[PDB]
Design a protein around this ligand. Structure first.
Ligand SMILES: Nc1ncnc2c1ncn2[C@@H]1O[C@H](COP(=O)(O)OP(=O)(O)NP(=O)(O)O)[C@@H](O)[C@H]1O
Ligand SMILES: O=C(C[C@H]1NCCC[C@@H]1O)Cn1cnc2cc(Br)c(Cl)cc2c1=O
Ligand SMILES: [Mg+2]
Ligand SMILES: [Zn+2]
Length: 493
């Protein structure tokens, strides 16, 4: 679905994308993020430079999500990047901890860990701040970078040794209020991917074998990349319960005067969202960005070459730019006489600009503009007097079309299998499995073991159970136990 629309002579250049998205996905992903000036590879493995074209999308994700959690009285703070070994020791993987072992030429007697997550940093101070039920709920969030020495092969955005993320940590007086906070954040995470990034995700609950061992319930949104047949956890929201409050002493005096441990939640979203969004919408021409996160929604390209644009040509472009600026549209004019219009067309197509305006003599004469849509090569002529109304509608239609097309690609990637004899062939088709499952830890341990023999794991137990179980008859697709619900399975990042 990547190489359907018309490619121009400049799209077939080396300044375009030469690797096919389906048959050469890894090379396609690298060319798309590099040639669009999103990412620069760094001489330290697993780290990638976030150029402004990609960092804008994170700033938009950060701006939109920060306003969302402020609706629930979540306050932003910043805790140090460092944490002692004693606090950190008591998905914690010791080989992932980046340790500062020297300052200058002086060795540290006790090395200091770089923050892989802030439970150890923050919770000793949650216990210090929380003495009464009146002090609850406490809701803290921080935007910061995280360093984890990932053992698996790094992927830009998806899995980086340094990534930018948001981590919210809340404490409540009741488990019910905490679980409501877990579901609230999960819906906002799903909104970030679907409403902002036009990326479909599946809301659900992690299995006992796949949940965060430090919490009671781990809910998540699962994404999927069909071109490689691997799911990707889009975000996560944990019902920590009292596991962390018991071990850090975060207790409060409830009403009537009894000491009770706090009911905590924690949730996180990283720059991985950008990578999942890129892989979802990008085609063989390069980036395809949702209008809500595209750094430039409209590029105005006057038909000029070598010489300077005429005075009436610059006046029309400024008028169109003024109309689009007043309408809240992010718009820029590319009046570089240095490049042919075809060069600019491919240049802003690789960068994923939603709409391009071609302004030539015929457009000046009619007081109209030639609009070319990025993702489907749709062409139309809009009068200048209609731009204020039509362009916000086109970007709105653009956003809906990306989510709708990405949705039907995800729905066709979910295959129902009721017996294990059809699971392996479904996985080999680069697709997920929705199967009747008993949800036992022992069952998933053998599911991972048997599928690794030809590994498949539970992605999430979806909140929306589209299929029904026979009360007392529907057995697990793998073992002899009765199936509880249907669970989404597949290989993941
Ligand atoms: N190295 C990474 N780079 C970018 N995003 C990441 C990375 N690791 C995790 N994430 C994302 O951040 C979210 C919250 O972090 P976390 O729950 O600690 O992931 P995780 O438990 O390490 N899962 P995983 O590392 O894939 O086994 C995850 O749901 C991922 O979507
Ligand atoms: O980090 C987590 C759980 C939650 N903490 C912050 C909010 C979002 C996030 O899902 C799971 N995790 C993952 N990787 C880790 C790596 C190391 Br090293 C350590 Cl010490 C700890 C962890 C660790 O705790
Ligand atoms: Mg990890
Ligand atoms: Zn089973």
């Amino acid at each position: 679905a990547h190489h359907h629309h018309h490619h121009s002579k400049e799209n077939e250049s080396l300044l375009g994308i030469t690797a096919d998205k389906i048959t050469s996905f890894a090379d396609w992903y690298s060319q798309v993020i590099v040639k669009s000036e999103m990412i620069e590879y760094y001489d330290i493995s697993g780290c990638y430079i976030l150029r402004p074209w990609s960092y804008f999308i994170w700033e938009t994700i950060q701006s939109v999500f920060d306003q969302k959690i402020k609706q629930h009285d979540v306050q932003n703070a910043y805790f140090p990047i460092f944490v002692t070994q004693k606090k950190l020791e008591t998905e914690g993987f010791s080989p992932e901890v980046a340790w500062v072992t020297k300052s200058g030429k002086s060795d540290l007697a006790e090395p200091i860990a770089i923050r892989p997550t802030s439970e150890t940093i923050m919770y000793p101070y949650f216990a210090k701040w929380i003495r009464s039920h009146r002090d609850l709920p406490l809701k803290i969030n921080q935007w910061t970078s995280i360093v984890r020495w990932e053992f698996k092969h790094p992927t830009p955005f998806i899995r980086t040794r340094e990534f930018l993320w948001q981590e919210g940590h809340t404490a409540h007086s009741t488990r019910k209020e905490a679980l409501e906070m877990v579901d609230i954040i999960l819906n906002e995470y799903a909104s970030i991917y679907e409403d902002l990034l036009a990326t479909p995700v599946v809301k659900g609950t992690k299995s006992e074998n796949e949940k965060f061992p430090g919490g009671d319930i781990t809910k998540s949104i699962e994404g999927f990349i069909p071109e490689i047949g691997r799911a990707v956890q889009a975000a996560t929201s944990h019902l920590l319960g009292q596991n962390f409050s018991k071990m850090f002493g975060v207790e409060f005096e409830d009403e009537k005067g009894n000491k009770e441990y706090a009911h905590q939640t924690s949730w996180g979203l990283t720059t991985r969202a950008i990578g999942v969004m890129i892989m979802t919408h990008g085609d063989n021409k390069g980036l395809v960005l949702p209008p809500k996160v595209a750094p430039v929604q409209v590029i105005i390209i006057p038909i000029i070459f070598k010489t300077v644009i005429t005075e009436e040509q610059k006046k029309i472009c400024n008028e169109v730019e003024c109309i689009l600026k007043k309408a809240g549209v992010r718009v820029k004019i590319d009046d570089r006489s240095n490049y042919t219009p075809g060069w600019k067309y491919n240049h802003w197509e690789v960068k994923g600009v939603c709409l391009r305006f071609e302004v030539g003599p015929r457009d000046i004469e009619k007081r109209s503009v030639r609009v070319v849509v990025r993702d489907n090569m749709e062409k139309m002529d809009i009068p200048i007097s209609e731009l204020e109304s039509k362009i916000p509608k086109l970007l709105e239609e653009f956003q809906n079309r990306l989510l709708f097309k990405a949705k039907q690609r995800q729905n066709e990637s979910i295959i129902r299998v009721d017996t294990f004899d059809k699971v392996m062939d479904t996985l080999n088709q680069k697709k997920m499995v929705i199967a009747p499952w008993c949800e036992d830890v022992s069952c998933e341990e053998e599911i991972k073991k048997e599928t690794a023999r030809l590994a498949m794991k539970s992605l999430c137990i979806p909140n929306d159970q589209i299929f029904k179980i026979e009360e007392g008859k529907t057995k697990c697709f793998f073992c002899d136990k009765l199936a509880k619900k249907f669970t989404l399975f597949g290989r993941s990042y």
